[PDB]
Amino acid sequence: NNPYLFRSNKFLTLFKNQHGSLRLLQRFNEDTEKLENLRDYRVLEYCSKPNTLLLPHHSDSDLLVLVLEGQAILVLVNPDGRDTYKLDQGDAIKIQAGTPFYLINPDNNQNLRILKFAITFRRPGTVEDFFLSSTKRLPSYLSAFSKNFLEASYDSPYDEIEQTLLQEEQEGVIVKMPKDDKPFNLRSRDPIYSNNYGKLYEITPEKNSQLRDLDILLNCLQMNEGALFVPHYNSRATVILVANEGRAEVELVGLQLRRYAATLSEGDIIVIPSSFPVALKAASDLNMVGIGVNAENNERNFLAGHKENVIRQIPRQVSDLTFPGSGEEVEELLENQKESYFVDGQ
Amino acid sequence: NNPYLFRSNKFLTLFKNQHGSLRLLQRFNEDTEKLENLRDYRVLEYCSKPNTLLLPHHSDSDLLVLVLEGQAILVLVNPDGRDTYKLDQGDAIKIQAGTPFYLINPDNNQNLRILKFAITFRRPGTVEDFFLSSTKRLPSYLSAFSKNFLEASYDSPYDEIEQTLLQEEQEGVIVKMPKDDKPFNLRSRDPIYSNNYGKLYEITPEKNSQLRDLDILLNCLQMNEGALFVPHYNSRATVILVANEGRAEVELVGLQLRRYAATLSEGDIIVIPSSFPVALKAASDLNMVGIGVNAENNERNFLAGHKENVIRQIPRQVSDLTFPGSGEEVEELLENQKESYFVDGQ
Amino acid sequence: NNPYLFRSNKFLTLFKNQHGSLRLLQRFNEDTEKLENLRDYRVLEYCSKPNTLLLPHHSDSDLLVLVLEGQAILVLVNPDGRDTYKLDQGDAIKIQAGTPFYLINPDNNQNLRILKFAITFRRPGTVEDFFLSSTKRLPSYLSAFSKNFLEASYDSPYDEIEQTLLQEEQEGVIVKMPKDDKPFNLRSRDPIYSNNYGKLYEITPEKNSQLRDLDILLNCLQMNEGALFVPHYNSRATVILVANEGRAEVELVGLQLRRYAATLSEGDIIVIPSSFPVALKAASDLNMVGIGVNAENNERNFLAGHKENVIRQIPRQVSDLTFPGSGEEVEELLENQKESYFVDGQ
């Protein structure tokens, strides 16, 4: 029915216990041919309660992690040392494939909600995580090496090894903290569109190094109840829109001619293909996050509103031949709307 | 039978009316595995009678347009203004995805014949065009937005909108002109091969910016009745050869060993895979256009003729062991032909 | 059963005669979904007896050739001249697609063993070779051109042509020498890991131009009977490991959790996916060659041994929560092994 809509019920549970959970969105091109260009990306969601730890592991994919709610302490381990980063809501950072890391929710009363965008390359569309410790689910990967191999490697009898490293200590991979380059924020720059109905912050590869290698753009959208983000479309970027807070009424048009409309609730996701005109209304105060792939050189073209409206650049004789009304009639209509980008949805 | 030949009857009609037409070549890998490397490209042809207009629309693909015959006025619309370019025969220009544009045939007695090479990325192998105006075939895309959405966007009652913008004015997307970076030419530089039998002009990514991002080379070939373009092959570039004027006898060799030969008439197309030796004879005076994909660093290696013949660089003892005749016998034979590139097909 | 193991019996014979042979490894993703990232590469092996010649031909693929044993004289022919390179064991060179070339084994008592890594782009996963001379198997490609075409091209009656060029002289493409940028070596730099149990030499794209365009890393591994290359994994590079001399016991771990182990004999090949931990023991003195694809920025992370061990960078409280033993117990165990990279397999 509507191939660009991914409701939260379409995420799959990798792990869940009383301290948090890890879910993975179904493959973008799982049951549609329309999203072939997104086959190398996977979206994950990590949520954990206070004073919890996600145990050390490395992923086989490059990850872009965004703190959607809360605060976290992220530790990146290298062969020669380690890097510790304190993440705030709205903070983003790229964890390269193969870097072991663990995450901590240090807050005493706030939950951690993190969005992980995965860019796969080893096996297109597949993300694997290698955890160092054994648990109910799965034994430590170190455990699959032969005794001989292990004994020689560490230079200790198998005994010391299976007791100090391989034995199952914890139950899951999210555990309770024993009861005793750099990240960037999506709001570190003025918004690009900002008025009394809405605000849009956006970081593009041309301005940020970590995004430059991924060819990804990131954006933070906030709108007031009843406001409307007017019909527009992206020239190059296909955008994965994530509903963070609030409810949104989204209308997407694509090519015979189809209208895909839906109301997104927190957790829901809608993918906006490059070139498709789209518009959305804040059915309530809302915040959304957007990840745009194929981002280099994207341009947003507006179809309504005063500023950046392409329809307003079409000359009169052309517009006369283009639309029903006369040149003067169309040019006036396009003037009625005084506001740009975000308008009143009343 | 012959997988690299696309006869004009294999183009498909998108739109046609008394003022012109738009056709799209079938997918290169439609019924052959052999052209997987061309799956992201589509070739289109636009032809229109005098004093006609192709209505404003944006495409979801990057387009390379070539004026094959006539003259045109192309207008590129941006959110802040517009650019107008007057195109002559042999003129080429790249229209980036998402840029709305319209085309005019200003001539009073000459037809417009334009070749559009499409480089897809949103949905590999698919080109979509979004037209602003409604017509018999399809309503304006603006029309698929809800009234509410439209009313708020423009700030006008739905009434003014459906009359000034969405109502069906024109019948098709090619209409009669009311009865009242920059483009480059394929001949802007001396030809690379030029003698009394033929001439070859060629623009490569290493010399032109717009071609640099597409990794495409373009070439214009003209030969005299009876002349022969001697056996040679391209090291990296796979070339789509388009028969513009005249008739051509083409012989293509590929690997068990196969000879694909055919006579191309105006409109016909033959694809020359990198490495395959190829040769062709002008059954009459002729002009052809070539679009080479995977162009960076292409090298043409000649198998006959005096200049740039690889066979003439093989040393004598090797050639002796390589061919039947003696070293001296082969080296002489290779001398018989005094001319290079283009020779006499008598 | 074990999808990453390619035993020498899986190579296929292209050509074989009393003077040598040419074999081609089956497609990496032939019967496994797991190696999609390797579908564009093919591995070939060329072996020839003394004073032999492999006849001139061009390939439609870029080739990386490595001299595994012996010495060779390689001649690269261009349209304007020729380049001759003398290759020694351990020498590597890239032959671009479309460059005709021939190879000679000048030694009087030593065989030539060359590994050819093919990077395809015309038809992903397919390598074609165009030989200039006709033989039992296949006629010269020049022979598929029409007489007319040939006569005009060379300017000689068909007679002189079919006798001097097209007639079948030799029997195969490897013949006996009539009884009368630049290549680089894998050891041109100090090894990166070097002790009394093993040595590892490695050339990465960041340090070598020819490798830079292929995004390939190359490495030469030599280990003493009984030594062990400790558990470690590659962050980005998927590595094709080729068993040159000796026997190796390899243990590879991948993700439910699987242990793929095997002993490699000379000629055998094992593919190590990025991120999978791997370890191997020299069942006898041994030399192996590795070709790593997706090489840019690869990092090797060690799981045992003193130097570059990631497990040793995990802080104590974390390790306590991560592993069974206490922080102190794990940190000590990880100290038992005094040596790094290569240890004793006794």
Short mmCIF file of N, CA, C and O in Angstrom, two decimals, chain B residues 97-147:
data_model
loop_
_atom_site.label_atom_id
_atom_site.label_comp_id
_atom_site.label_asym_id
_atom_site.label_seq_id
_atom_site.Cartn_x
_atom_site.Cartn_y
_atom_site.Cartn_z
N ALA B 97 19.77 16.73 -11.75
CA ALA B 97 18.51 16.21 -11.28
C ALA B 97 17.78 17.27 -10.46
O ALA B 97 18.40 18.08 -9.78
N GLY B 98 16.46 17.31 -10.55
CA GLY B 98 15.73 18.26 -9.74
C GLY B 98 15.66 19.69 -10.17
O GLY B 98 15.02 20.49 -9.53
N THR B 99 16.33 20.05 -11.25
CA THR B 99 16.25 21.42 -11.74
C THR B 99 15.07 21.51 -12.70
O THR B 99 15.07 20.82 -13.71
N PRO B 100 14.06 22.35 -12.41
CA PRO B 100 12.95 22.41 -13.36
C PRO B 100 13.43 23.16 -14.61
O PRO B 100 14.27 24.08 -14.54
N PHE B 101 12.96 22.73 -15.77
CA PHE B 101 13.39 23.41 -16.98
C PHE B 101 12.36 23.21 -18.07
O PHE B 101 11.48 22.34 -17.93
N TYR B 102 12.43 24.04 -19.11
CA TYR B 102 11.56 23.91 -20.29
C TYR B 102 12.42 24.26 -21.48
O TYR B 102 13.44 24.96 -21.38
N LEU B 103 12.00 23.72 -22.61
CA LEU B 103 12.73 23.84 -23.87
C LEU B 103 11.87 24.43 -24.99
O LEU B 103 10.69 24.09 -25.17
N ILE B 104 12.49 25.31 -25.76
CA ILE B 104 11.81 25.95 -26.88
C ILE B 104 12.55 25.79 -28.21
O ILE B 104 13.78 25.91 -28.28
N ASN B 105 11.76 25.54 -29.25
CA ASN B 105 12.26 25.43 -30.62
C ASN B 105 11.82 26.78 -31.21
O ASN B 105 10.66 26.98 -31.56
N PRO B 106 12.75 27.74 -31.28
CA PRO B 106 12.36 29.04 -31.83
C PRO B 106 12.31 29.15 -33.36
O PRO B 106 11.69 30.11 -33.88
N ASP B 107 12.92 28.20 -34.08
CA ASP B 107 12.96 28.26 -35.56
C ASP B 107 11.64 28.14 -36.26
O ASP B 107 10.76 27.36 -35.87
N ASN B 108 11.55 28.91 -37.33
CA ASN B 108 10.37 28.98 -38.15
C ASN B 108 10.24 27.91 -39.20
O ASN B 108 9.15 27.71 -39.73
N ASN B 109 11.33 27.22 -39.53
CA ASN B 109 11.25 26.16 -40.52
C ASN B 109 12.10 24.92 -40.26
O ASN B 109 12.15 24.00 -41.08
N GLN B 110 12.75 24.89 -39.10
CA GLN B 110 13.63 23.78 -38.75
C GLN B 110 13.14 22.99 -37.53
O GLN B 110 12.64 23.56 -36.56
N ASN B 111 13.28 21.68 -37.58
CA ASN B 111 12.88 20.85 -36.47
C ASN B 111 13.98 20.72 -35.42
O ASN B 111 15.16 20.89 -35.72
N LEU B 112 13.58 20.41 -34.19
CA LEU B 112 14.53 20.22 -33.09
C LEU B 112 14.63 18.73 -32.81
O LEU B 112 13.62 18.03 -32.64
N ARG B 113 15.87 18.24 -32.81
CA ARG B 113 16.17 16.84 -32.51
C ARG B 113 17.24 16.87 -31.41
O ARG B 113 18.38 17.27 -31.65
N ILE B 114 16.86 16.46 -30.20
CA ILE B 114 17.75 16.46 -29.04
C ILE B 114 17.91 15.06 -28.46
O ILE B 114 16.93 14.33 -28.38
N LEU B 115 19.13 14.70 -28.08
CA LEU B 115 19.44 13.39 -27.47
C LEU B 115 19.64 13.67 -26.00
O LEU B 115 20.39 14.60 -25.64
N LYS B 116 18.94 12.94 -25.14
CA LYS B 116 19.07 13.13 -23.69
C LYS B 116 19.66 11.86 -23.10
O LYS B 116 19.04 10.80 -23.18
N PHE B 117 20.86 11.96 -22.53
CA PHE B 117 21.49 10.79 -21.89
C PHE B 117 21.19 10.91 -20.41
O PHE B 117 21.61 11.88 -19.77
N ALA B 118 20.50 9.93 -19.86
CA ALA B 118 20.14 10.00 -18.44
C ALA B 118 20.95 9.09 -17.51
O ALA B 118 20.99 7.88 -17.71
N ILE B 119 21.55 9.70 -16.50
CA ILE B 119 22.33 9.00 -15.48
C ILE B 119 21.46 8.93 -14.20
O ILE B 119 21.34 9.92 -13.47
N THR B 120 20.84 7.78 -13.94
CA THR B 120 19.98 7.58 -12.78
C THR B 120 20.72 7.20 -11.49
O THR B 120 21.79 6.59 -11.53
N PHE B 121 20.15 7.54 -10.34
CA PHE B 121 20.77 7.17 -9.05
C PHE B 121 19.73 6.94 -8.00
O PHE B 121 19.95 6.17 -7.08
N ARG B 122 18.58 7.59 -8.11
CA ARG B 122 17.55 7.35 -7.12
C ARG B 122 17.06 5.92 -7.25
O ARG B 122 17.04 5.17 -6.28
N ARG B 123 16.62 5.54 -8.44
CA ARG B 123 16.18 4.16 -8.71
C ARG B 123 16.94 3.78 -9.97
O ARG B 123 16.48 4.08 -11.08
N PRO B 124 18.06 3.05 -9.82
CA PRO B 124 18.88 2.66 -10.97
C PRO B 124 18.08 2.22 -12.16
O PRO B 124 17.29 1.29 -12.07
N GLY B 125 18.27 2.91 -13.28
CA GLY B 125 17.57 2.54 -14.51
C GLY B 125 16.17 3.12 -14.70
O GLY B 125 15.43 2.70 -15.59
N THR B 126 15.81 4.10 -13.89
CA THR B 126 14.49 4.66 -14.01
C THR B 126 14.59 6.15 -14.03
O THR B 126 15.34 6.71 -13.24
N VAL B 127 13.86 6.79 -14.95
CA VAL B 127 13.87 8.24 -15.06
C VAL B 127 12.44 8.66 -14.92
O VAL B 127 11.60 8.12 -15.60
N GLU B 128 12.17 9.60 -14.02
CA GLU B 128 10.82 10.11 -13.81
C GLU B 128 10.90 11.59 -14.07
O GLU B 128 11.92 12.24 -13.77
N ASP B 129 9.81 12.13 -14.62
CA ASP B 129 9.71 13.55 -14.93
C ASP B 129 8.47 14.09 -14.23
O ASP B 129 7.40 13.51 -14.34
N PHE B 130 8.60 15.19 -13.51
CA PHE B 130 7.46 15.74 -12.81
C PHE B 130 7.02 17.03 -13.48
O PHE B 130 7.70 18.06 -13.36
N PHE B 131 5.90 16.97 -14.16
CA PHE B 131 5.40 18.15 -14.85
C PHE B 131 4.46 18.95 -13.99
O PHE B 131 3.58 18.41 -13.32
N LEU B 132 4.65 20.26 -14.03
CA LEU B 132 3.86 21.18 -13.24
C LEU B 132 2.41 21.36 -13.66
O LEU B 132 1.56 21.68 -12.84
N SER B 133 2.14 21.17 -14.95
CA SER B 133 0.78 21.36 -15.47
C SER B 133 0.04 20.10 -15.74
O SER B 133 0.62 19.09 -16.08
N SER B 134 -1.27 20.18 -15.61
CA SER B 134 -2.10 19.02 -15.87
C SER B 134 -2.44 18.94 -17.35
O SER B 134 -2.53 19.96 -18.03
N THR B 135 -2.63 17.73 -17.85
CA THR B 135 -2.95 17.53 -19.25
C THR B 135 -3.79 16.25 -19.33
O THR B 135 -3.94 15.56 -18.32
N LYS B 136 -4.30 15.95 -20.52
CA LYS B 136 -5.14 14.76 -20.74
C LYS B 136 -4.57 13.55 -20.01
O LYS B 136 -5.24 12.92 -19.17
N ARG B 137 -3.32 13.26 -20.34
CA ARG B 137 -2.59 12.14 -19.78
C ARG B 137 -2.56 12.16 -18.26
O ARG B 137 -3.20 11.33 -17.58
N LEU B 138 -1.85 13.14 -17.72
CA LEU B 138 -1.69 13.23 -16.28
C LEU B 138 -1.86 14.62 -15.66
O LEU B 138 -1.38 15.64 -16.20
N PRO B 139 -2.57 14.68 -14.52
CA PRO B 139 -2.81 15.93 -13.78
C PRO B 139 -1.51 16.47 -13.17
O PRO B 139 -0.54 15.73 -12.97
N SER B 140 -1.48 17.77 -12.86
CA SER B 140 -0.30 18.34 -12.25
C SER B 140 0.00 17.65 -10.92
O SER B 140 -0.93 17.27 -10.19
N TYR B 141 1.28 17.48 -10.59
CA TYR B 141 1.58 16.83 -9.33
C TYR B 141 1.07 17.70 -8.19
O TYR B 141 0.72 17.16 -7.15
N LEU B 142 0.98 19.02 -8.37
CA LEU B 142 0.46 19.86 -7.30
C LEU B 142 -0.95 19.45 -6.92
O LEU B 142 -1.40 19.61 -5.80
N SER B 143 -1.64 18.86 -7.87
CA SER B 143 -3.00 18.45 -7.65
C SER B 143 -3.19 17.31 -6.68
O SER B 143 -4.30 17.11 -6.22
N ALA B 144 -2.14 16.55 -6.38
CA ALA B 144 -2.28 15.41 -5.46
C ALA B 144 -2.22 15.77 -3.97
O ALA B 144 -2.44 14.92 -3.09
N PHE B 145 -1.89 17.02 -3.69
CA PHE B 145 -1.86 17.50 -2.33
C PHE B 145 -3.31 17.76 -1.88
O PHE B 145 -4.15 18.15 -2.69
N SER B 146 -3.61 17.53 -0.61
CA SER B 146 -4.96 17.78 -0.08
C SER B 146 -5.32 19.26 -0.14
O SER B 146 -4.44 20.14 -0.10
N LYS B 147 -6.63 19.54 -0.24
CA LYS B 147 -7.14 20.92 -0.31
C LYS B 147 -6.58 21.75 0.85
O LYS B 147 -5.99 22.84 0.70
#
